[PDB]
């Protein structure tokens with residue numbers, strides 16, 4: 001019988017819906033619900049498991065656990081990858097870098113200080129900035145065309161780095 005070490009429940013009869021992660025050292029599985037992990041962090045881990053190298057309680061050596069540090073780090077590197085891509089675009093930067101962060105520079109300062117703890121927080125901050133700009137940059141034709149280009153560029157960057165994340169469903173899009 002294969003049991004989750006954190007609830008002691010056998011998972012042999014667990015249905016497909018049971019979200020779990022595998023320990024890379026002993027191949028045993030652990031329920032996401034039994035671990036200190038949010039839905040987001042579970043998906044980040046599951047999208048690229050080898051980057052975190054999760055280890056169960058029986059195989060974990062140090063505290064805090066190495067996998068936890070690795071996963072936290074991964075989140076930060078991923079957020080930075082998205083912001084860097086946006087800032088490296090002249091047009092996007094022109095429109096959004098310089099005007100709760102109110103511009104991309106504000107997001108950069110908040111991020112560099114390691115203040116972002118979730119993808120949704122980071123995403124919403126940026127969606128709000130983009131939508132605010134779209135709502136206020138006027139009606140010049142080139143501006144109208146750029147508005148859609150910028151929104152799409154952001155969505156593409158988020159889908160590349162966080163494919164499991166619903167950026168299109170942000171409550172802050174109008």
Ligand SMILES: [Zn+2]
Nearest residue numbers: 004007031034
């Ligand atoms: Zn469990």
Ligand SMILES: [Zn+2]
Nearest residue numbers: 023026056059
């Ligand atoms: Zn293990």
